[PDB]
Every structure is written in C-alpha cells, then in structure tokens.
C-alpha cells in the first residue's frame, strides 16, 4: 500500500545529483496506533537546496544530520490526519513538519506535528511549505533582522536567486519594507521577465549573459545598499564590489557551492574581502531556526500581505512520490520558478 523514498546513493561531496540518488519502495504501515500517535496522509512534500548537504556522509552543518543509505528521506511536509490517538489532533486536521518522511502515509508522533489553518493560505495548503512557511519566514526575518532597511531612505536592494522561493519573496518584501529600488539576478530571460512583469522588481539581471558586473552597473547606478544573497560565488563577488558603505548582506544561502567541497560559511576572496572591510559591509551568518519567537508574527505578517494580494506566491509543481529525485535535481539546476513542490496525493 505505502510507497517511500530512500536515499539510494550519494553523489560524493563534489558530485552533481542524479534522479537515481533516490529510490522508491513499498512497505506495510502498522495498522495500529499506539498511545500518542497519528496516522497521516501526505499531501505535499518540499524539496530544498539544504537537502544537497544531507546527501553527504557529512553535512558540514552541525544542525542537519546526513541521510543514511537505504533509509527513508524526510523534510518539510503537509498532510491530513486520518486516525489519531493524540488529543490535540483529529481526522481531517491539516498538519505540517520539517521532519516529514517521504512516504504516501505515515504514523507520526502527535507532539511532532503542528496543525495549520487553511484560512491563512486561501486554501492552498502547499503555501505552508513556502511563502507562508519556512522559506517566507527566512526572507521576511532575514530582511527585518539583517536588512537595516529604513522606509523612505531610498535604498537599492540586489537579490540573487531572485526567481526562486526565498528570492522572489524577499525582493517583494524588500519593496513593502521601504526600499525604493529592487533588482533581482537570475539564470534566464524568462525568469527575468517574471521578476519585472509579475513581481514588480524594478530590474532583473540575467547572469547567463555573462556580464553581471556591467549589467549591474547599469541597473544599479547608485550602488547597492542591501544584498539578499542566496547564491554566493562570482555572482556575489560582483554585487559586493558594487555595494556602498555601511550596507548589508543578508547571508541567506550560497547555492553555487553546494555541490563543491566547500565549508558553508565560505570566506569572500581576499580582494572582495578587502572591499567589504573598507565600506563597512555587514555580512553575518543567518539561520532562520535561530529566530523562532519571530515565527508567529512573521506568519501573521506574511499571511496578511498574501491575503491582500500584496505578496505574490509562485510555485513549480511536480507530481508523485516517485518523482522526488527528479524534482530535487531539477530545482538544484534551476528548473523551477518560485518554490519547488511535489504533490503527493
Ligand atoms: N538561511 C536560512 O535559514 C535559509 C536559507 N536558504 C537558502 O536560500 C537559498 C535559496 O533557497 P530556495 O528559495 O529554497 O531555493 P530556490 O527556490 O531559489 O531554488 C534554487 C535556485 O538556485 C538557482 N541556482 C542553482 N545553481 C545556481 C548556481 N550555480 N548559481 C546561481 N544560481 C543557482 C536556480 O535559479 P536560476 O535559474 O536563477 O539559476 C534555482 O532555481 C539557498 O541557498 C538556501 O540554502 C533557504 C531556506 C532557509
């Protein structure tokens, strides 16, 4: 009856993922719930860049454990309760977890699940894995805490990985919080058009064209005061070179390095480091799990905006548990616009 996806092989610390890294298998769910458990039917599962690290024997992060071979993978999920021997939850209840196993159905611990209210997302439950969830909180809290945005101050925000989930939301949050100019950098023209025609970014820079330096100059004459960074690498050495004094880098992620033998908090190149030092550019580690008491208000704020249509939510949806592998790989190589999600039932 139940299908589950396990990690079949690892790509090596310096390898690129293949769909085949994951494998589907069938298993029998125990038909009896012991005290405290709930049986849930999986509705949606998330795939996210941090999972590339969990495919390594060593994740390089002390707060992410590696996945083991032949064992079921896991991550952000949203499902519906079917049977429940736990008081706070009953049939039809919608619950979520960041440790949801990649299974059609599961028997989880009631204390490990949080019930979500369909109203906050206009019924689109998959949003709780994105804009109205971890990714949106990362963009909102990242900006509110490391952004030093001052309404009317007339700052310019550069957002990398701008057509991804965190990027598309931050650029928009950027505007709503006071920045007057927001420019996104992404890997392709159609993504660029999405940023300016649907999200409202003032400009887009296609880095596949090959002259990020120059495009940036032109799109940013006046320097960069805020850089929501999702990619790191050359792209970042370029936004930084053009940042102004006392500006800030929200160090959200560095996806360009994930498949290279590289310590997540990599250090800027000597010359680039020199410039950061001179203009006094704040570049501090940012991990959203460190701001837990800011989640409910962040949730209420993001929901509010979404509900007023002030915050546009875009997603790319794949279908079926047997396609976790390919949806994960596809996202890591840019096949998604917005949050990558996989529909499970
Ligand atoms: N600090 C925190 O708490 C959190 C951090 N993050 C980080 O935020 C970043 C974005 O996450 P998320 O919104 O889930 O994912 P995205 O929705 O942004 O999906 C990944 C995107 O990265 C881009 N990309 C892939 N390889 C490269 C490359 N070599 N150079 C430049 N861009 C590349 C692609 O877009 P394109 O077509 O433009 O290349 C791809 O679509 C990640 O680095 C992630 O680790 C996420 C959650 C929390």
Swiss-Prot record:
Subcellular location per UniProt equals:
Cytoplasm
Can you list the disulfide-bonded cysteine pairs?
A: none
Any one GO biological process: prostaglandin metabolic process
| EC number annotated for this UniProt entry | 1.3.1.48
UniProt signal peptide: none
Q: Name the predominant localization.
A: cytoplasm
Q: In which tissues is it expressed?
A: Widely expressed with highest levels in adipose tissues.
Name the UniProt key words of this record, in alphabetical order: Cytoplasm, Lipid metabolism, NADP, Oxidoreductase
**InterPro entries, from UniProt?**
ADH-like_C, ADH_N_2, GroES-like_sf, MDR_fam, NAD(P)-bd_dom_sf, PTGR2
Q: Which family does it belong to?
A: Belongs to the NADP-dependent oxidoreductase L4BD family.
Q: What is this protein called?
A: Prostaglandin reductase 2
User: Can you name the source organism?
Assistant: Mus musculus
């Amino acid at each position: 009856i139940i299908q589950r996806v396990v990690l079949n092989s690892r790509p090596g610390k310096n390898g690129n993922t293949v769909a085949e890294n994951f494998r589907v298998e069938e298993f029998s769910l125990p038909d009896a719930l012991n005290e405290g458990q709930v049986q849930v039917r999986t509705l949606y599962l998330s795939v996210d860049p941090y999972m590339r690290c969990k495919m390594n024997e060593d994740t390089g992060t002390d707060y992410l454990a590696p996945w083991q071979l032949a064992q079921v993978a896991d991550g952000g999920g949203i499902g519906v309760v079917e049977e429940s021997k736990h008081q706070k939850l009953t049939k039809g209840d919608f619950v979520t977890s960041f440790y949801w196993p990649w299974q059609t159905k599961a028997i989880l611990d009631g204390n490990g699940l949080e019930k979500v209210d369909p109203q906050l997302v206009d019924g689109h439950l998959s949003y709780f894995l994105g804009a109205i969830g971890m990714p949106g909180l990362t963009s909102l809290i990242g900006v509110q805490e490391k952004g030093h945005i001052s309404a009317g101050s007339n700052q310019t925000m550069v957002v990398s990985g701008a057509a991804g989930a965190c990027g598309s939301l931050a650029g928009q949050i950027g505007h709503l919080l006071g920045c007057s100019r927001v420019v996104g950098i992404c890997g392709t023209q159609e993504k660029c058009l999405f940023l300016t025609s649907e999200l409202g970014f003032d400009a887009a820079v296609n880095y596949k064209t090959g002259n990020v330096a120059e495009q940036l100059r032109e799109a940013c004459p006046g320097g960069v005061d805020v850089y929501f960074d999702n990619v790191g690498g050359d792209i970042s050495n370029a936004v930084i070179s053009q940042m102004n004094e006392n500006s800030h880098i929200i160090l959200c992620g560095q996806i360009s390095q994930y498949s290279n033998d590289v310590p997540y908090p990599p250090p800027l190149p000597p010359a680039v480091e020199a410039i950061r030092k001179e203009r006094n550019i704040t570049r501090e580690r940012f991990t959203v799990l460190n701001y837990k008491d800011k989640f409910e208000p962040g949730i209420l704020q993001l929901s509010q905006w979404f509900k007023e249509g002030k915050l546009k939510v875009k997603e790319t949806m794949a279908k079926g548990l047997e396609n976790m592998g390919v949806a994960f790989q596809s996202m890591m190589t840019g096949g998604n616009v917005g949050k990558q999600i996989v529909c499970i039932s």
